[PDB]
Structure 1
Amino acid sequence: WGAQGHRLVAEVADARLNPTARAEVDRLLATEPDATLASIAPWADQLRAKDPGLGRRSAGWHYVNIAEDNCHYEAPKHCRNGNCIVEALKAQSTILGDRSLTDGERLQALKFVVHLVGDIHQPMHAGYAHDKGGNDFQLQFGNRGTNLHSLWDSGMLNTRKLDDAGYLPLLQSQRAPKLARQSNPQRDPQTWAEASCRISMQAGVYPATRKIGDEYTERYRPLAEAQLRLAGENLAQLLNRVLGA
């Protein structure tokens, strides 16, 4: 997602934290002045200005290309060197839960976990290798030149013309998604990436025309918004388990 999508996932999650996780999240955040779960949510996309080395090191962690393999993830094939979102989310969840680390080390892991739970729910972050997750599927969207990846990251969300305070209660007023009975931090990332990939492969998500507009928005913006709500609920359930026991 773009930055607004990341912040909305965090804002949905923040309100669903249990008291234990609330307290520990606030304590980790307070080690960095002005940090909130929302403000840190875009951080992993913004590393070029102040931590370009980490940005280079972690750029592959934002996606996994499994649509060629019918949305059946295999770590050795799809995640060489741990360089994909499934293995990165698993590792950063472990690091976040390691109370023996410094606050700085745990906060960095929190920033990755918040971002990556968002990205692993963006269908085009779990799509085809051969068109770079839709980046090479060129579109005109209300006449603007774009691509299917960007359309899902921000194009459709931008059509609401809402700030976070207007968009958040829209997401919260949706029907509640049915979550797993418990967080499994090491198994859930694969489940989520495969679910996202299956959306990318649904008939119509790749549109029949390159010229699209309101018809596509009216059909699929609700699904993008459902995915933001689902990501936020999944992020809260994960933080409640890792930080809230």
Structure 2
Amino acid sequence: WGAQGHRLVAEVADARLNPTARAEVDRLLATEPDATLASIAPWADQLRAKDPGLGRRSAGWHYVNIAEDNCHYEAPKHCRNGNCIVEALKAQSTILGDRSLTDGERLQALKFVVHLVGDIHQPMHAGYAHDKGGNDFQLQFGNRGTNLHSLWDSGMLNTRKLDDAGYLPLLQSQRAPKLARQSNPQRDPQTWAEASCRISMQAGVYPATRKIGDEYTERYRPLAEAQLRLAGENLAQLLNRVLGARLEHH
């Protein structure tokens, strides 16, 4: 996603934290001036500016392109050296949960988990390798040139002309998605990447022409918005497992 999609995933999740996860998230955020779950959500995309070395190391962590393999993930083939979103989200979830680490280490992991649960719910972050997740599929959207990747990351969301405060309650108004009955931080990333890949391959998501407009928005913007809600609910369920496992006896 672009920055707004990332912040909205985090805003959906933030309100769904259990009291233990609320307190631990707040404690980690308090170590960095002005940090909220939402404000840190775009951080991992900003590393060319903020941390070039980490930026180069983590660039591949934002996606996993499995559509040519019919959305069936295989770590050795699709994720050599762990350099993809499935294995990165698993590892950052483990790091985040490791209470023996420093606040700085666990806050960095939190930044990645918040971002990556967003990205693993963006269809075009789990799509074709051969066109770089739709980045190479250039098209006209209304009167403006873009590409299929950017259309899904932000172009459709931008059609609402809402700031986060306007967009958030719209996402919250949707029918609740059915989640897994339990969080499994090591197994759910693959599930989510494969589901996102299947959307990238759904009929019409790749349009039959290179000139689209309101018909495309009206059909697929609801699905992008459903994916933001789902990502936020899945992020809260994951943080509740990693950071909120005990109320009594914490």
Superposition deviation, residue 101 in structure 1: 0.1
Q: 1:137 touches 1:148 (CA, 8 Å); kept in 2?
A: yes
Q: Deviations over 1:19-45 (max 9, x none)?
A: 000000000000111100000000000
Secondary structure of 1:65's counterpart equals coil
Cα displacement string for residues 24-70 of structure 1 (whole angstroms, at most 9, x for unaligned residues): 00000001111000000000000111211111110000000100000
Post-superposition Cα deviations, 1:164-217, rounded to whole Å, max 9, x if no partner, equal: 000000000000000000000000000000000000000100011110000000
Structure-2 residue corresponding to 1:238:
238
TM-score with structure 2 length normalisation?
0.98
Do 1:152 and 1:224's aligned partners in 2 also have CA atoms closer than 8 Å? yes
Number of residue pairs matched?
A: 245
| CA–CA separation in structure 2 for the residues paired with 1:30 and 1:131 | 41
In structure 2, C-alpha distance between the alignment counterparts of 1:181 and 1:98, rounded to whole Å: 24
Correspondence 1:107 to 2:113 = no
SS of equivalent to 1:195: helix
Structure 1 runs of 4+ with >6 Å offset: none
Q: Does residue 32 in structure 1 map to residue 42 in structure 2? A: no
For structure 1, list consecutive stretches of 5 or more residues without a partner in the other structure: none
Q: Percent identity?
A: 100
Distance 1:34 1:94 in 2: 25
Hey, what does 1:186 align to over in structure 2?
Answer: 186
Counterparts of 2:8 and 2:74, CA distance in 1: 30
Deviations 1:122-161 (A, max 9, x none): 0000000000000111110012111100000000000000
Shift of 1:96: 0.1
The whole-number CA distance in structure 1 between the counterparts of 2:11 and 2:4 is 10
Which TM-score applies when normalising by structure 1? 1.00
Q: Is the 8 A contact 1:143 1:211 kept in 2?
A: no
Q: Secondary structure at the match of 1:37?
A: coil
Contact 1:64 1:79 in 2 (8 A): yes
Q: Distance in 1 between matches of 2:197 and 2:50?
A: 32
CA distance in 2, matches of 1:149, 1:174: 24
Structure 2 distance, partners of 1:32, 1:138, is 39
Q: Secondary structure at the match of 2:49?
A: coil
